């Protein structure tokens, strides 16, 4: 029971232990959206948190300090000063070097697991990229760390078959929130089936069962983009076919997403914002009921 | 020290802890064999268990309840009522929803590890399928959970080279029971070599060493199909090349196995039953000696 | 808390109290170098250790016994008598059978972690081989076990892109020692970027941060070959293209390095020896400062 006393890794948690909490990544705000819409979303998520009675804990690293529950001003400062995009393996160097960093899903789940946050929300996870050599730390983290992650499936830029198959391989359980269709970020339909659940109570029973059986995996609760905003995948696919990928590593994802906003004259941005907002609502409902 | 109390995940063990025990999956009985042969195999295995002095604990999920040591009547009910095929990640879903489920090797090792069963028997494990995107949870579980698994290698429908290579990558130790040839389910030879051991005592020395050095991996003890039933691999390969794969996910394996039974007029079925029965015998000898 | 008492796994540690320690593999000496050069290097590395104030613990298995801190005379016996090349999964097998074995990086990190050695030194790690189905245990180990590993990157015979991507996927942190370029064993130049650190104090900060945040991964400290011994990678590649790979499994790596010694007229042997010696120095500096 007697654990080590930290010196180098300073965590500043603004989260009340006795109150529902949803963790959220910073890279969506810093690298995944334009500034104006990024701050509008933050504000809207905070509004939803007040409406529903949960704490929204945006997670980032500010000059080497891990902050759970960043403020708007902190997020603006981060965007203005610049911040590396970090997954799990990058957390140590940025902490050691005293840098700003915006977390992906992998780092966000990793850190959430160490500060008592069980429900995390994102837009879409990383996965296996076309070519099947470039593979997100997100998959590794979900195979290693227990949480409930609300998402609209996996990002549209990915090798869908390879990612969906590897989620099975890695023993990452999936459930569709009121759908049997694995969602694909901008798109509702994938033609891949998942088990359907009808309410948040069912999520909690699965998750509690995972705990009892010591299954240390992320539960993916899949929440499709609202129909009104969806862009059918057949349409996204074809745009992706025109884009020469000029970059690698962590720039790949931001690069393609920014290109798709340009190409669809903002349609993908509208979709992305809509699903992020819906996902925050669902994540909040889960966090509120978990806390009972 | 102090562990949680289970509420959702009810395990009914019919094992006497003081007697030797071998765990066995349900999917082979429910999805991998025809009913008549499945029940005759179950009865023959129990007979062997009584003759050699170990308990055969067939593991499955009945209306959400984990049963270790299913009866012939329970297995018949499962067949009649239907059961999901479940690997590890699916256990929580079926427990939560109160469904029947027949376990694969992954789920069976995972549960065995939580209920004190150290020896598991199968016919052939899953692996990397042709195309190398579809990969069994069996590999992940074997790379995560310690047990002694007796099998006749990996199923003949797999990408043999990719699977054999990944077993090494994942640090999954393989030993031939009185052979240096990696077996391939219906076939005695794969063309690949493994280290050989001579007896059950040598298996247990490896296993005990793994415990002492905290190597949490499955030890695969390889037992070839009897020579009078074996089918040369090239024959199976040529048949498989004539099958259009009309299914995906969990259906792939039972689909291909059923097609091969039809194409070989039961030749593969007789091989499969032969190797299952011999594997039960070897697993029971290990379980009996382990018990001291 | 109370741990088990060992019976089967005898570990003989020659490490003394009150002294920094660096762990080192045996397969380099046994399978990776000619006899004369290997014994020469062992003596040199010992000299560096006495002069700099650390213990160099060459790890191997002598007739089933794990020895940390082998003598010259033991190494010589091992070469004369023969030793299996073993990664992690093979340790229990050779321990049980009472065989000599020379450890790879995987086995060396695994063992080091169980005997309190935190700094390990090698020349180059394994990785993803061309074709991408053969993948070293080294990668799995580094994604499972915490240590500081000094190497000159990954061996030149590997699929460099695949390996480099998989290091990210598995969450293996990398830092360049006074370089931003990922080294390639005989070559300094990969065109692949890593974060640059300037001194051993920076290494220790990153490593201590990893402990505090429960990141159980190997930290790769990347030390390029000295410029006077460097061979351009394209030159190495051109030569590898002229080789028919006539072998599989563990034999691949030594088979190809030997061929390169032959085709290059000792040139790779000389580079190999120089980087191993420089890596020993760096690992010793790390070990000494860690202990404080
Ligand atoms: Mn503001
Ligand atoms: Mn439990
Ligand atoms: Mn990537
Ligand atoms: Mn131990
Ligand atoms: Mn063939
Ligand atoms: Mn599959
Ligand atoms: Mn800590
Ligand atoms: Mn290999």
CSV table of C-alpha atoms in Angstrom, one decimal, chain B residues 113 118 141-149 170-175 202-221, chain C residues 4 6-10 66 87-96 110-111 114:
chain,number,residue,atom,x,y,z
B,113,UNK,CA,-6.2,-18.4,-14.9
B,118,UNK,CA,-3.3,-24.5,-14.8
B,141,UNK,CA,-4.1,-14.2,-24.4
B,142,UNK,CA,-1.2,-16.7,-24.6
B,143,UNK,CA,1.2,-13.7,-24.6
B,144,UNK,CA,-0.6,-12.4,-21.4
B,145,UNK,CA,-1.6,-15.4,-19.3
B,146,UNK,CA,0.2,-18.3,-17.8
B,147,UNK,CA,-1.0,-21.9,-18.3
B,148,UNK,CA,0.1,-25.1,-19.8
B,149,UNK,CA,-1.8,-25.6,-23.1
B,170,UNK,CA,5.1,-12.7,-28.4
B,171,UNK,CA,7.5,-14.7,-26.3
B,172,UNK,CA,5.2,-17.7,-26.3
B,173,UNK,CA,7.3,-20.8,-25.5
B,174,UNK,CA,6.8,-24.0,-27.6
B,175,UNK,CA,7.9,-27.5,-26.8
B,202,UNK,CA,10.2,-32.0,-18.2
B,203,UNK,CA,7.1,-30.0,-19.1
B,204,UNK,CA,6.5,-29.3,-15.4
B,205,UNK,CA,10.2,-28.2,-14.9
B,206,UNK,CA,9.8,-25.6,-17.7
B,207,UNK,CA,6.5,-24.5,-16.3
B,208,UNK,CA,7.8,-24.1,-12.7
B,209,UNK,CA,10.8,-22.2,-14.0
B,210,UNK,CA,8.4,-19.8,-15.8
B,211,UNK,CA,6.6,-19.2,-12.5
B,212,UNK,CA,9.8,-18.5,-10.6
B,213,UNK,CA,11.0,-16.0,-13.2
B,214,UNK,CA,7.6,-14.3,-13.5
B,215,UNK,CA,7.2,-15.1,-17.2
B,216,UNK,CA,3.4,-14.8,-17.7
B,217,UNK,CA,3.0,-16.6,-20.9
B,218,UNK,CA,1.3,-19.8,-22.0
B,219,UNK,CA,3.5,-22.9,-22.4
B,220,UNK,CA,2.3,-24.7,-25.6
B,221,UNK,CA,3.0,-28.4,-25.3
C,4,UNK,CA,8.2,-17.2,-3.3
C,6,UNK,CA,13.2,-20.2,-5.8
C,7,UNK,CA,14.1,-23.9,-6.4
C,8,UNK,CA,14.5,-24.5,-10.1
C,9,UNK,CA,15.8,-21.2,-11.2
C,10,UNK,CA,19.3,-20.7,-9.6
C,66,UNK,CA,21.7,-18.0,-14.8
C,87,UNK,CA,15.5,-14.8,-26.2
C,88,UNK,CA,13.1,-14.5,-23.3
C,89,UNK,CA,10.8,-17.3,-24.1
C,90,UNK,CA,13.6,-19.8,-24.4
C,91,UNK,CA,15.1,-19.0,-20.9
C,92,UNK,CA,12.8,-21.5,-19.1
C,93,UNK,CA,13.4,-24.2,-21.6
C,94,UNK,CA,17.3,-24.0,-21.3
C,95,UNK,CA,17.1,-23.6,-17.5
C,96,UNK,CA,15.0,-26.8,-17.2
C,110,UNK,CA,14.1,-9.6,-18.8
C,111,UNK,CA,16.7,-11.1,-16.5
C,114,UNK,CA,14.6,-9.5,-12.1
